[PDB]
Amino acid sequence: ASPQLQMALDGFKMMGEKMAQAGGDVKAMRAVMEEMATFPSAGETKCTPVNAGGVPAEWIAAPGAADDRVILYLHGGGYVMGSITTHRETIARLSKASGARALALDYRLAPEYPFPAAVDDATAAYRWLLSQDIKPSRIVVAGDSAGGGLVLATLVALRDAKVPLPAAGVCISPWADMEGTGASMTTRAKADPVVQKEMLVNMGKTYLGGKDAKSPLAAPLHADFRGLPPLFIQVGDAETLLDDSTRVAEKAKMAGVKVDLEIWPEMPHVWHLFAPFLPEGQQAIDKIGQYVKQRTA
Amino acid sequence: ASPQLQMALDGFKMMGEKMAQAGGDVKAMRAVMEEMATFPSAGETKCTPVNAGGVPAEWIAAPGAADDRVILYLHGGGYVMGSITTHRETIARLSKASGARALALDYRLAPEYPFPAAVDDATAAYRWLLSQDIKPSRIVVAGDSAGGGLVLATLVALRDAKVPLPAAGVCISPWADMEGTGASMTTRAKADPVVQKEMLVNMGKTYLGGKDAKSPLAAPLHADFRGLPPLFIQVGDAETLLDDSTRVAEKAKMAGVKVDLEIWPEMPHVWHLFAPFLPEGQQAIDKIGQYVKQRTA
């Protein structure tokens, strides 16, 4: 609302500053994000670890979510950090709001497993879902920041490989440009308390392992969008990644894709994560909820 | 349990500044507290307005909560502000954690309705509960800050009037001493982001109506405690009101009252109010749940 928004902004502002303090050290960075993670929904949420075609994963089901309606969820963390643990609360709420069971992927991360390890797990995971006899028309592939990028990458890979595509793709504050050439990397630098050009390019370099920064599957800004299923893109105005969402939305419509873009005024990066006390976070999760139903009916 | 406590502390520090910038403007102050309050539990909580013996009130029942087991909840806000609206969330979490239906009072506030109106509403609300065939052994009277105070005053007044007493009383960071004479007004003044002596003595004066500050039903540190039911007192170590709790716990013990005092390290004033994201918030509420449950078996 705003004393709520201002809690969340100082929230990231502190996350943002412990980030800097970890330096290049990736164990530290991982701990900064894991320390912010709580799971207040745990008590009423069913969690079942599972191997998703060789990808460590977890079924996350809010009460009376359908077995046969499925979100394949791809967590953010710059392709170097995050885990089922950091995003578990958001996924549970998306499950509730959508009446769908989530498969939350623990996909391999950089520097240990650089690009395209993440993409191969996502695709492996999706192909596993089809193997379990879940209809493609009952699945949506959803993710935030890096994982929002990985949603586009994944759909592109799947379409290349000629695998039945899913009912839609949901991108929260997606990261699609590895070089940070977006206008918003300057016009939203003041407003954004955590994502900045330098730290993001550095995280990109780590993901790429010296491979080409314009590789479609790593930087889906530069990917071919023709034939992808409907895309839902939520992004905040107070985001250096605003123009990853604006440019992807423009390019996909031009390619004939059905896109819905929401630019949430004053909201910061993956504001969904502050859902428990930030009304906009839960509002944004309820909109995704409805989208998944109107797409999987 | 620290990136979260730091968000909470910043929360209070923002609130404390908005308090100071209303001056003594009571309309404005009442707006600061409404600003900060949300009700994320609303969707699963049954809320029923009611007149409680000529006191505007609300039944608030979490799922599972029983009709015949009740918390008379008495909200904080220094006897001048707060409402059912400010404390709805904390009250619904106390409802779920305790498996008890709660009655939230919009008790009358100074300076429109100075001391003793709050105490007359409280006791009027209590006797009404009894008129509705709710057994006193199935009642707990619970309150935070000013409302913590009001729990003590209410049990004193009820005992003096020979009204059959409830199973227990619960005081969260209770305000017992109108003159702020405790060691913690000096030893915890740096640590506590929200309660300072000056602002609080001056807020007592508003409640008192120039009546005596040692007045037992206004300052229950000075009340006789002999006869009162069991008390649960929870207070933060990072609180100027810490010694209100320790002093009240020592007097009460000495007067034969079965008293359970918990000092919570680093925690600030009514840290419960941050339960949605602050884990020690929800823990503190979970304990009150267990206390109410064991005291009403």
Numbering used by the authors:
A (entry chain AAA), B (entry chain BBB): 2 to 298
Which of the paper's sentences describe this entry?
By screening several hydrolases using this assay, we identified a member of the family of bacterial hormone‐sensitive lipases (bHSLs), Est8, as a promiscuous acyltransferase. We observed that its substrate‐binding pocket consists of a well‐defined tunnel, which leads from the protein surface to the active site harboring a catalytic triad (Ser146, Glu240, His270). Remarkably, this tunnel is highly hydrophobic due to the presence of several methionine residues that are part of the N‐terminal cap domain, a helix‐turn‐helix motif covering the active site. As typical for bHSLs, the cap domain forms the most significant part of the substrate‐binding pocket of Est8. In contrast to the conserved C‐terminal catalytic domain, the cap domain is highly variable. As discussed for CpLIP2, CAL‐A, and MsAcT, we assumed that active‐site hydrophobicity also plays a role for the acyltransferase activity of Est8. For Est8, product hydrolysis became more dominant than acyl transfer quickly after reaching a kinetic maximum at low concentrations (ca. 27 % conversion) of 2‐phenylethyl acetate. On the way to reaching its thermodynamic equilibrium, the reaction is rapidly quenched by acidification, thus indicating high hydrolase activity. For most of them, the relative activity quickly dropped already at low alcohol concentrations, thus suggesting low stability. While Est8 and the homologues described above maintain their activity for over a month, purified WP007 precipitates within minutes after purification, resulting in a complete loss of activity. By using our hydrophobicity scoring, we were able to identify five bHSLs with much higher acyltransferase activity than Est8.
Est8 is the first member of the family of bacterial hormone‐sensitive lipases (bHSLs) for which promiscuous acyltransferase activity in water has been reported. Certain hydrolases preferentially catalyze acyl transfer over hydrolysis in an aqueous environment. Herein, we provide evidence that acyltransferase activity in esterases highly correlates with the hydrophobicity of the substrate‐binding pocket. Based on a detailed structure–function analysis of Est8 and several homologues, the present study aims to clarify molecular prerequisites for promiscuous acyltransferase activity, thereby enabling sequence‐based prediction of this remarkable phenomenon.
